[PDB]
Amino acid sequence: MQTIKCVVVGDGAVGKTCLLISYTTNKFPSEYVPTVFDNYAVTVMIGGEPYTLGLFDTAGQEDYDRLRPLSYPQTDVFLVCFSVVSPSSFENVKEKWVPEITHHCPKTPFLLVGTQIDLRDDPSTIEKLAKNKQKPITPETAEKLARDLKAVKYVECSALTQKGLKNVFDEAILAALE
Amino acid sequence: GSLTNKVVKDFMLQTLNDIDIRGSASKDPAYASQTREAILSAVYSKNKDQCCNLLISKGINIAPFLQEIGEAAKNAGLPGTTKNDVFTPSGAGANPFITPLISSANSKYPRMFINQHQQASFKIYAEKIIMTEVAPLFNECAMPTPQQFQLILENIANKYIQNTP
C-alpha cells in the first residue's frame, strides 16, 4: 500500500551490492557474491501499515554521469556509501555524491554509510593504506563529514558479519518517514 | 478490478518512452557511448551470474571462466580493472535503465510487486524492452551489439558447462 524508495550511491568497490544482498537474504553470500542485486521490493509492515521498501543499487555506474540521474526521481532516502578502508571513496562523498544527489533531490534526506568495517582492523588492509600514507576512516572522522554535509546521521556496517547492517536500513526507513 | 501484469508492463513501457534513450542518445554522444557501455555491461553481468551460479552448484571453480568473459568484455570495448589476473568491466552491476522502470512501477502498483516471482518477471520484461529500445544505438559501431556479445559469452559459458557433469 505505502512505498519507500531508497537508492544506494557511492564509489565502485565500496560494497553497495554486497550490503544490499547481505541484507535482503539475511546472510553473507559465501564464495560467490552475485553482480546483480535482485530483491528490489522488500515488503514490510510499518506503523501498523503494509509497505514496500524499494531498494535500488547503482553499482557499475560510477562513470556514467549521464545515466545516473535516471535512478533519482521520487527517491525518499539515499544511502551515500563509502568504505572505511577507502579514503578516496570517503572524499568522494563530499566532492561528488552529496553534490550530485543534492542537485537532483535537494529535499531528500540521506544517510552517510560507512561500509566494510570488518576490514578496518585487518593487518593486510591497514598496511596497504600505510604504504600510501593513509589510515582507515574512524567513525569520529566520518561523523565530522556527516555533520558538514548535513546527513541525517552516520551509520556503518559490515555486509560480511552483518554487524550494523539491519540498523542501517531501520535508520533509512526512519529517515524516509521523518 | 482490472490491474493485471499487462497493466504494469504497459506502464513500464510508458516510462521507457519518457526516458527516451534513442532521442537522448542522438543529442548527446556522451549519453550514447555511456548507454552502449552500460548495456553491454548488463549483458556481461547477467551471463556472469547465470553461469557462475550454475558452475558453483556443480562444484566447479569459477576463476578460469571469469578470466575468459573478462577478456571478452575487454575486447568488447568495456573499460575495467584486473584482480588476480581476472578482468572485470567497471560498468558491471546495476543496469541504469532498469531502476527507473522498476522503481516507478513498484511505486504505482506496489501490490503487484509483493510476489517474488512477479518481481523477477517484471525485471526480465524491463530488460527486454530496454534491449529492444537500445539496439539501433549499436548500428555501424565497432562495439559488438548486445545480441552478438551475449552470444559470445554464451559460447564461452557453454564450453565450461559441457566439461562439468
SS3 B156: helix
CATH number at residue B38: 1.10.4120.10
Residue A164 labeled ligand binder: no
Whether B19 has its CB under 8 Å from any CB of chain A: the answer is: yes
Whether B67 has its CB under 8 Å from any CB of chain A: the answer is: no
Q: Which residues have CB under 8 Å from A83's CB, separation 6+?
A: A11, A13, A14, A15, A89, A90, A114, A115, A116, A119
Of B28, B92, B100, the CB nearest to A60: B92
Q: Is residue B123 within 8 Å of B98, Cβ to Cβ? A: yes
Q: Which residue of B has its CA nearest to A64?
A: B34
Q: What is the dihedral of CA B148, B154, B159, B160, to 10 degrees?
A: 140
What is the resolution of the experimental data for this entry, in Å?
2.3
| Helix/strand/coil percentages in chain B, nearest 5 | 70, 5, 25
Q: How many Å apart are CA A55 and CA A134, to the nearest integer?
A: 33
CB contact under 8 A, A60 and B93: yes
- Pick among A3, A30, A46, A64 to test the B interface (most B CBs inside 10 A): A64
Within 8 A of A3 by CB-CB distance, chain B residues are: 106-107, 110
SS3 B92: coil
Q: Which residue of A has its CA nearest to B56?
A: A32
Whether B59 has its CB under 8 Å from any CB of chain A: the answer is: no
- Count how many domains chain A has: 1
Judge residue B77's burial from the number of C-beta atoms within 10 Å of its C-beta, 0-12 exposed, 13-18 middle, 19 or more buried. middle
Residue A52 C-alpha cell reads as 514496500
CATH number at residue A21: 3.40.50.300
Q: How many Å apart are CA A28 and CA A60, to the nearest integer?
A: 21
Residue A107 C-alpha cell reads as 529535499
Q: Which domain holds residue A175?
A: 1-178
Residue B90 C-alpha cell reads as 567497471
CB contact under 8 A, A67 and B96: yes
Whether B110 has its CB under 8 Å from any CB of chain A: the answer is: yes
Separation of CA A24 from chain center: 14
Q: Which domain holds residue B72?
A: 1-165
SS3 B111: helix
Task: Print the SS3 string covering B127-153.
Answer: HHHHHHHHHHHHCCCCCCCHHHHHHHH
Residue A82 C-alpha cell reads as 563509502
Residues B51, B52, B55, CA angle at the centre, nearest 5°?
A: 85
Q: How many Å apart are CA A109 and CA A78, to the nearest integer?
A: 7
Report which of A10, A89, A36 is spatially closest to residue B47, judged by C-alpha positions: A36
Whether B100 has its CB under 8 Å from any CB of chain A: the answer is: yes
Of A5, A37, A70, the CB nearest to B19: A70
Of B56, B90, B97, the CB nearest to A63: B90
Q: Is residue A82 within 8 Å of A10, Cβ to Cβ? A: yes
Residue B150 C-alpha cell reads as 551475449
Which amino acid, B69?
A: I
Sign of CA dihedral B5, A40, B22, B11: positive
CB contact under 8 A, B107 and A54: yes
CB contact under 8 A, A63 and B41: no
Alpha carbons within 13 angstroms on the beta-carbon side of residue A119 total 22
- Count how many domains chain B has: 1
Q: What are phi and psi of A116, to 5 degrees?
A: 55, 40
CA distance B140 to chain A (A): 22
Report which of A101, A36, A6 is spatially closest to residue B106, judged by C-alpha positions: A6
Q: Is residue B93 within 8 Å of A58, Cβ to Cβ? A: yes
Residue A61 labeled ligand binder: yes
β-pairing, A49-56 with B86-89?
unpaired
Q: How many Å apart are CA A106 and CA A90, to the nearest integer?
A: 21
Residue A114 labeled ligand binder: no
Q: How was this structure determined?
A: X-ray
The DSSP line for chain A is -EEEEEEEEE-TTSSHHHHHHHHHHTS---S---SS----EEEEEETTEEEEEEEE--TT-TT-TTTGGGG-TT-SEEEEEEETT-HHHHHHIIIIIHHHHHHH-TT--EEEEEE-GGGTT-HHHHHHHHTTT--PPPHHHHHHHHHHTT-S-EEE--TTT-TTHHHHHHHHHHHHH-
Q: How many Å apart are CA A24 and CA A27, to the nearest integer?
A: 8
